[PDB]
Amino acid sequence: FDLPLEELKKYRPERYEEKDFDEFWEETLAESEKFPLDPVFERMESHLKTVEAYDVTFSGYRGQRIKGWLLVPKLEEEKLPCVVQYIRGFPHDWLFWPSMGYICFVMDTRYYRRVFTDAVRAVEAAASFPQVDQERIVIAGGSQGGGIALAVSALSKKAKALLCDVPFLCHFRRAVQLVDTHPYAEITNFLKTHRDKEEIVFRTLSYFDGVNFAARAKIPALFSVGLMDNICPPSTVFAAYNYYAGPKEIRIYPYNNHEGGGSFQAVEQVKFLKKLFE
Amino acid sequence: HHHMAFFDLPLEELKKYRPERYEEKDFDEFWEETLAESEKFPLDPVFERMESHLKTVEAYDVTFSGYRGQRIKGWLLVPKLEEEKLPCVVQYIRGFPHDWLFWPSMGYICFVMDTYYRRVFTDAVRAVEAAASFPQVDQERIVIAGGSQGGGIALAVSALSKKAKALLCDVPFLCHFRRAVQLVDTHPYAEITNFLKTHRDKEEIVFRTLSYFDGVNFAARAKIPALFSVGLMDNICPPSTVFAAYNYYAGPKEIRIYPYNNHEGGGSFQAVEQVKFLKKLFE
Amino acid sequence: FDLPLEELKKYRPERYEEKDFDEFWEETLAESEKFPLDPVFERMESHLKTVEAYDVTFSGYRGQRIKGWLLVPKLEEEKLPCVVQYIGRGFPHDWLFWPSMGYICFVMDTRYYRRVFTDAVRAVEAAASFPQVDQERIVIAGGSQGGGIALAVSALSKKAKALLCDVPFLCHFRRAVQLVDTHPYAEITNFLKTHRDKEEIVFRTLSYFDGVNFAARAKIPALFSVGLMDNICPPSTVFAAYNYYAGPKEIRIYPYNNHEGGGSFQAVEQVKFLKKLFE
Amino acid sequence: AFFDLPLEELKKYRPERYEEKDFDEFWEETLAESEKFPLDPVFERMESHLKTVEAYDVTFSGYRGQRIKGWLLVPKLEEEKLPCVVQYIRGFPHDWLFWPSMGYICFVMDTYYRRVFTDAVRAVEAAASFPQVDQERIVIAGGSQGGGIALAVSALSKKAKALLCDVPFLCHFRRAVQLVDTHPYAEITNFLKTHRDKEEIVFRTLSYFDGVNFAARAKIPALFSVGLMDNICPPSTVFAAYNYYAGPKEIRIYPYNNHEGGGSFQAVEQVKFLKKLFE
Amino acid sequence: FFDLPLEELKKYRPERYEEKDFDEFWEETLAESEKFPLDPVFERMESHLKTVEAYDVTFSGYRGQRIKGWLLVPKLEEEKLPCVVQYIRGFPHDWLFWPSMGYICFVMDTRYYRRVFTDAVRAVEAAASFPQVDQERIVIAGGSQGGGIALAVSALSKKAKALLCDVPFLCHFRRAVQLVDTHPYAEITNFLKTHRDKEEIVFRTLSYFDGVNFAARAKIPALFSVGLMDNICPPSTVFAAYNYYAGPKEIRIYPYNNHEGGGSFQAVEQVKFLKKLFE
Amino acid sequence: AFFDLPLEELKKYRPERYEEKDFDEFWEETLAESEKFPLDPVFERMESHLKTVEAYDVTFSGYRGQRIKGWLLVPKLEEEKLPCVVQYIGRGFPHDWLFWPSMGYICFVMDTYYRRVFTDAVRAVEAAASFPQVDQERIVIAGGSQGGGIALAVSALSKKAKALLCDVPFLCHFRRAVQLVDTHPYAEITNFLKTHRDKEEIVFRTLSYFDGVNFAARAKIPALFSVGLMDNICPPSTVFAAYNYYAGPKEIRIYPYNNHEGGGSFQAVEQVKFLKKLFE
C-alpha cells in the first residue's frame, strides 16, 4: 500500500517545525531538572531466579515521582550494559535484555511533554544504578515507545545508542492521509469534527514529531520497519530514518505488518549492539 | 463470526458440567499399541550445545526419535544455576530459543518441542523421555505444559506418559468436539464443521474418529496433579469444552478462571500462577 | 442459534391473516385468467446435445408477457414428468440437473409478490401446455425466494402435483425479524427502524404472502429441506411452514448447514422422493 | 438482532445493587466542596446567523471552581418566562435548535465522572440563574453518556424538575461488560483483560457512578427510552436503571432500534410528555 | 485518501458521454408533466413547534401524480421570505435549520430518476406558489442522492436561483464504479457482474441522469462541497461535476471527512454564501 | 474495486521469470518415476439416478503408483467416439459435473505436494485416454483456480492433452501475488514468510518449480484463458503474466466487473464455442 522501496529509501519530505522547537524543549527540561532526580531502588519480591528485580522511584516531569522497573541479570560482571525500554505487565515480560546480559530499565508512559520529559529522566535514573555502565546505555522502544525513544535520542545527554522499531509519532500529516487505523486515526477523528483546527493541530504536533527529533539526534541507531505496517506506515518511518542525523542502519521486513521483524529483529539488535560496543 | 461477550453456559453451570463421554471400546488398546510401535525404535536423544547470544541460559538443539522412529526436533534451555538437579517443563507449541525464556528464568529446564494427532501425541510422549534423559533434569519434577493445541496435546500426554509428574493445561483445544462445533464458527473447530457441511453422510465416522483424540477422554484417565486455565470469553476454545475436560480430569486439580479474557487466557498473570502452583506442589 | 430440534418439530405458532386472504388470491388469479395464456415455444439453437432448449413466452400477471426456458431431455418417452423451477433465468445450461434426471424443466424468469406469485401460477399452466409434458407428474420447485414462491403455488395452482420446497424465504416474517439481522429479512427490520409507526401495516400486508398461511391450505405431497445453521432463513421459520403444511410431507434436516441447505445431497433426495411418489 | 433478555423479563428485571456504605457521603461531600466557590454565571450574547433564536456563550464555575462553558439558546417569543431544557452531550449553536424551536430555553453543556457530574449539577444552577428561565420548569436531558449524566443529576440537583433519559450509558456496569464488546463499555473489559487482579476495585469504584444507584434515589418525574437492539447500551442495563428509578416514570420502548433509540419519534414523545406534565 | 490528489482533482475534466437526444428527452419529459395543473395545496398542521408554522403540502409531479412535501415557515415580520427547497421526509422538526436561519423550507418526500427529477422540478414550482415566498430568492439544496437531484434541477428549473450541492451522488458513474465497492454505486457493479453483455446499455441509460451532464448546462450560482475521504461519493466524481458546472461557483473542500462532508460547518458556509449572494 | 495494473498495461505485462537450471530435469524425472508403475485404469459403472449420462467410478495409478480416484461421465449419444474434458477441482456428486457431458463431451473429473498433485493430474489424462469411447485427438484439460493452475502445468507436461481451458488460475506469479493481495490462498505464503523471515530465497526458488508462468512458457497446445479484473484471490497481473508467456495459440476472455467468479456461465459458453471452432 505505501511508496515502493526504491522511493522510500530516497524519501525526504519537507519538515514543519516552529521557530521555537528547541527553546520549547530546552525550557521543558530545564524546568524539570530544577528538582533533584533522587532515584530510589527497592528490591522486589520475585519468583525469578536468573534476574533481580527493583521497583525504581525517580523525579520526572515537574518533580513528580515516577516509577520504573529495573531488571538485573545475575552475572559475575561488576558493570553491565543497560537498555532503557519504553512502552507494562509483569517484570517477567521483560526478560529478553537481561537474558542477553543487559540491565533493563522498563518505564510505562503514565501530555507528550510530560511523557518525553519522564523518559529523558528515566535514562538518568538508570544511569544512577552503580552496576550500570554509562558508556553502554541504550534507549529502545517499538510503536509509541519507538516514537518516545526517538525523541529521547535527541534530548538525553546520557543515552549512547538508539533501537527504534516501527515508530509511532512520525510524519503526522502523511500518516493521516495513508491509514485509518489507531493511533493515527485519532487525529483524523478530531479533525473530522473540528474542521477549523487543521493548522493548530499540525503546528502543535510538530513539537512531538519524530522526524524533527531525528534531524537533531547524533547517537548511533538501529531502526526497523514493516513494509506492510498499516499502523505505522513505512513512509513515516523512512521519513524519520532518512532525516536521522547519527550513524544508522535500518532492517526492512517486507512481508511484516506492525509486528515488524519480531524475534528476528530482537537478535539483530543484540548483534548491532555487540558490534557497536567493541 | 465472533460471539459478543459471554456466550457459553454461566459459571455456576460450567463448574457442574459433565456431559456424556463418547469413546470406542478400543480407546486404550489403540494408544497402548501406538506407543508400543514407536518404542520399538531407540529414543537416541542427542543434545548439541548451540552458539547463542544468551548469557543466563545455555541452549541445546535436541534431536530425538518420536512417532515410528522419525527424528523430531526440540530446544533445551538450561538456566545457569549452582543446582546439580533442576526441575523441568516440557512445553508444547518453535521460533527462537529466546522466545522460551520464562521457565528457565524461573529456575526450570525447558524442553520446547517443534510440532496426524496419532503422530503428534506420540512425538509429545517421547519428548518427555528425551527431556528426562538430560542428566541435569530431576525426574521427580518433570512438568508437561501447553496452551491451545499445546494444551490439548499436554492433556493427552498426562494420560500417556509414565514419566510426567504434573500438568499445566491452558485454554486447551481438542476437547469436547461435538459441543465446540455447535458453539463457535472459529478456526480451528470450524474445520470440522466445514468438513461436515460438505460430507453430510460422515457425521458418525468424523465423531467416532475424533473420540480417540478428545481431551475429555484422556482427562478421565489422567492421575497426575494439574493446573488448568480458562477464558470465559474464549471463542476459539469455548469454556464448556475446557470445563468438560477439567471436570472429568481424574488427578488432583485446580482451575484458574479468567472471566474477561478471550483465548489469551490469563496470559502473564497465569504464568505466575503456574510458578506458584508448582512451587507448592514440589516443596 | 434457534430453537432446538425437539422443539422445532413441534413448533406451531399462532397464524395471522386478513379476513380476505382467500378472496384476495381468488380475485388476483381470476383477473389474470381473463387474458389468454398464449404459450409460445421457440426451439433454440444450442450447443447442448442431451437436451433440447425452448425459449418460452407466456401471459402472467395482468396479461404481461413473461419469459422462461424449457429444457427437454432427449429420451424415447412420448410423455415426460416435469419440474417447474423458480428462482434471473441465466443460461439454459444452468438448469441441467432435472433434464439429466429425466424431467422436463420449466425455468421461470422472476421480475410485487402479487405479480410474482401470479406469474408463477401461470408458469405451471405454460409448462402443462407442452405436449410432451405428463400432467399427472408436474412438480413445482424452489429454494430461498424460489422456495417461498413454490410454497405459495402449492396452494394456488390447480395443475401442480408435488412440491419441492428448500430453505424457503417468505415464511413466518414476524419471527424471522426477531432472530436474524441478515438480508433479506433485515429489509423489513430496516424499514421499521425508520418508520416506527408502521408495524401493524407492514405485518398485515406481509400476511398475504406468508408461506405459513399458504402451507395451511396446500394439499399436494411435498419434500422440504432445512439447514439448522441457516441464518438467512432460520429453522423456526421453515419448520413453521413445514408443520402447517396440510398435504403428505417429509422434511430433510441438515444440522451443519447454513443456507446452502443439503446442496447436492438434497438434490438426490428429491429425485428419490419423486421416484417413490410417482410409482 | 435481539440478544438481551426478552421484554417480559426486562420489565421485571431488578438485579441486586452494589454500592459502598459511603455513596451518599461521597456525593454530598463532592458537591459541598464545589459549592464553596461562587457559581458566578456570565452570559455573553453572541453574534449569530440565527433569526428565531438568541445565543449566549455561558461561563460558570463547576467542579472545584473551574470555569466551564455552555451555550444558552433562547427562542424569540413574546413570553417573559420560559421553560428550559439543560441538555448534556457542543458543536455549533445551530445543532441544538430542537428545544428552542419547541418553546424551551436550551442550556447545552460542553462535557473523571466526579468532575463531570459536578459540572453538570452546576450547569443546572447556571441555567436557573438566567432571569427568563422558569425555575418550576427546568428539565434535564441526555442520550448516551449524556443520559447517564442526566440520570445522576436527577438525584443530585436541588433545582431540576424533570428527567429525559435516552439510551443511557453509565448503567449496570457489571452486566454491560458481560453482554457487549462495543465502546464504551468495552473499555472496562479491556482494562480487566490486562489487570486481572483489579476486578473488585474496578467495580467498587464504578459503583459511585452507576445510574442504577442514582435512579434508586431520584424523586423527580422522568421519561426514559430504550432500543431493544441497542448493543452499545444494552436493554438490560437501561431497564435496571428504569426499574429502580424512584420518581414517577414512563419508558418508551423501541423494539427494532439500535442505539439511535426512538430518534425523531422519541423527540416528539418528550415534547408531549413535558406538556402533559407542566399543565 | 484513495482518489486523485487535490492538485489533480481541481483540474479534472474527463470526457463526457451523453446521447444525441439528452436535451430532447428532458424537454419532452417536463412538457408531458406540465400538461397537468400543478394544483399546490397547503394545509396548516397542528404542531408543537413555536418558532415555525408547518404545512402539509400536496402537489402534482411526474405525470400528474400527487406528491407530498412539508413547508416550514419561520414566524418573522417579513411579508416576503427567501426559500430553500431541500431534497433528500421524517418529522417537520427534522428540517429546523433553514427556517431558524430565516428561510422558508420546502422539503420534498423522494418517492425512476425520470420520475424523481420531474417531481423535484415541480417541487420548486410548488414552493414558488406560496405567497410568502420571494421568487428572486428560491434556493435548491441537497446532499448525496439529494445533491444529485438538486444538481439536475439546477439545469431543469426556470424558477430556481441558486444551488447548494453537497457530496452529490449520481455523478460520473463510469468512474465511481471503478473506485468504490460501496452502496449506492456498487448496485451498478453488481448488475454488470451478472449481466456481462449490458455494459453499453447500462452506461448509455445512466448518461441521461449523470450530474456531470446537467452541470455543463446549469447557469445559476452554486456552492458545492466535497469530502476527500468520501468513499460513497468519491472526490473525482464530485470534482467532475463541479468543474463542468457552468454557472458562478465555489467549492468547500473537507480533507479529513468521509461522506458526512463538512456537516454543520458546511451548513454555516451555505448561510454565508447565500447571504453574500442575495445582497 | 479495481486495484491492479490497468488493462492497457496488463496486456503488455511480461515480468522477468525465475526458474532453477534443473526445472525440466526435475519434471522429466518426476514423471519417469511415476511411469515405472502401470497405470492400470479400472472403470466401474455406477448405480445413478441419471438418465442422459452413464457414470463410472475410476481408479488409476498416479504419483509413485498410488491409487487415485475420479469420476467418468459419458453422455448417452449415438457417436462411437466422443471428445473429452479432463476437469481438475470434493469431487462432490457425479451430478455436479453435468455441463460437459450435456455439451457432448465425456468428462473425467479428478479428486485432487504439488509434485504429487501435478503428477496425479498428468496421469488422469492417460486414464481418460484409455476409455475406448474417448477420441484421443480431442482430449481437453480444464480447470478454474487451483484447478486452472494444475491444468496449466498439465498443458506443458502431458503428451496426450490437446487443448487447455484455464480460468482465473491460482499458482501463477507467486512473488507478485504476495505483494498485491492478503487473501487465501496466496496469503499462506505471506504468513509463512512473516514468521520465517530468513526463508525468502528458498521459498521462492522452491515455488518456481510450480509456477504457471514457467509452464506457460513451455506449453505448445491451444488454450482459452479467463480473467476477472476485480479478482483479489487470483489477481489480474498474475493471470496476465501466465497468459502472456503462454507459448501456444491462445485467447483470453476478460471480465472487467467480476471477482474470482470470473465469467461464470457466460465463460462456459465461450469455452464450448472455442472448442467447437478448434476441433473442426
Curated annotation (Swiss-Prot), chain C:
An example molecular function term from Gene Ontology annotations: acetylxylan esterase activity
Keyword tags: Calcium, Carbohydrate metabolism, Cellulose degradation, Cytoplasm, Hydrolase, Metal-binding, Polysaccharide degradation, Serine esterase
UniProt-listed GO biological process terms: cellulose catabolic process; cephalosporin C metabolic process; polysaccharide metabolic process; xylan metabolic process
Binding positions (paraoxon): 144
EC numbers, comma separated: 3.1.1.41, 3.1.1.72
pH dependence text: Optimum pH is 6.5. Half-maximal activity between pH 5.0-7.5.
Catalytic activity: Deacetylation of xylans and xylo-oligosaccharides; cephalosporin C + H2O = deacetylcephalosporin C + acetate + H(+)
Record's subcellular location: Cytoplasm
Regulation of its activity: Activity stimulated by up to 40% in the presence of divalent cations such as BaCl(2), CaCl(2), MgCl(2) and MnCl(2) at 3 mM concentration, but inhibited by 82-85% in the presence of CdCl(2) and ZnCl(2) at 3 mM concentration.
Activity relative to temperature: Optimum temperature is 90 degrees Celsius. Activity drops sharply above 90 degrees Celsius. Stable up to 100-104 degrees Celsius.
Leading EC class: hydrolase
UniProt superkingdom: Bacteria
GO cellular component, one term: cytoplasm
Effect the entry attributes to changing residue 232 to A: Greater than 10-fold reduction in catalytic efficiency toward the acetate substrates. Reduction in catalytic efficiency towards fluoroscein diacetoxymethyl ether
Function: Esterase that removes acetyl groups from a number of O-acetylated small substrates, such as acetylated xylose, short xylo-oligosaccharides and cephalosporin C. Has no activity towards polymeric acetylated xylan, 4-methylumbelliferyl acetate or alpha-naphthyl acetate. Able to catalyze rapid hydrolysis of a range of substrates preferably with acetate groups, independent of the alcohol moiety. Exhibits a narrow selectivity for short chain acyl esters (C2-C3).
Subunit structure: Homohexamer, formed by a trimer of dimers. Also exists as a homodimer.
Family statement drawn from the similarity comment of this UniProt entry: Belongs to the carbohydrate esterase 7 family.
Protein name as annotated: Cephalosporin-C deacetylase
Species name: Thermotoga maritima (strain ATCC 43589 / DSM 3109 / JCM 10099 / NBRC 100826 / MSB8)
Organism placement in taxonomy: Bacteria, Thermotogati, Thermotogota, Thermotogae, Thermotogales
UniProtKB/Swiss-Prot annotation, chain E:
Active site: 144 (nucleophile), 230 (charge relay system), 259 (charge relay system)
Temperature-related activity annotation: Optimum temperature is 90 degrees Celsius. Activity drops sharply above 90 degrees Celsius. Stable up to 100-104 degrees Celsius.
GO CC annotation: cytoplasm
Localization terms from the record: Cytoplasm
Binding site for paraoxon: 144
Family listed: Belongs to the carbohydrate esterase 7 family.
Function summary: Esterase that removes acetyl groups from a number of O-acetylated small substrates, such as acetylated xylose, short xylo-oligosaccharides and cephalosporin C. Has no activity towards polymeric acetylated xylan, 4-methylumbelliferyl acetate or alpha-naphthyl acetate. Able to catalyze rapid hydrolysis of a range of substrates preferably with acetate groups, independent of the alcohol moiety. Exhibits a narrow selectivity for short chain acyl esters (C2-C3).
Protein name: Cephalosporin-C deacetylase
Species per Swiss-Prot/TrEMBL record: Thermotoga maritima (strain ATCC 43589 / DSM 3109 / JCM 10099 / NBRC 100826 / MSB8)
Gene behind this protein: axeA
